Amino acid sequence: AHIFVKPELVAEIGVKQLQREIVLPGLVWTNPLTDFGGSKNDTITVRVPAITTA
Amino acid sequence: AHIFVKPELVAEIGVKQLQREIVLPGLVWTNPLTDFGGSKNDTITVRVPAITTA
């Protein structure tokens, strides 16, 4: 019988271990505050503007 | 009365911790001997010449 020496080939075709989709980071108000250095206790105060009545 | 939300502002004005002036290094015999590497025990011997009596 004919006998041949062949390379066991390996391919990546797009089969990935199943892990959940990432949605929440895009849906949440992300990084409106950045200058967290140069702020006491890593805390940035957020000011909520005043409301007046007529 | 009215109340406002303001930041604490940290400023540099030129107030410094007072330190003395360095004067001693320029007044002391510095480096008449240099090749401490290349001598046993990091030591260079200095030879003081002989004095004779009559």
DSSP codes of every residue in A23-38: -HHHHS---S----SS
**Closest-CA residue to B3 (of A26, A19, A29, A52):** A52
Backbone phi, psi, residue B48, to 5°: -100, 125
Cβ pair B7:A45 closer than 8 A: yes
Q: How close A21 gets to chain B, by Cα (Å)? A: 40
Chain position carrying tokens 């200058």: A35
DSSP E strands: which ranges in chain B?
none
Question: Which positions in chain B touch A48 (Cβ < 8 Å)?
Answer: 5
Distance of CA B33 to the CA centre of its chain: 19
DSSP A37: S
Q: How close A49 gets to chain B, by Cα (Å)? A: 9
Residue B37 and residue B43: Cα distance in Å, rounded?
8
Token pair in block for residue A11: 């391919």
Question: Do B18 and B31 form a contact (C-beta atoms < 8 A)?
Answer: no
Token pair in block for residue A5: 């020496």
Residue A29 and residue A43: Cα distance in Å, rounded?
17
Q: Which residues, including other chains, have CB under 8 Å from residue B33's CB and lie 6 or more apart?
A: B44, B46
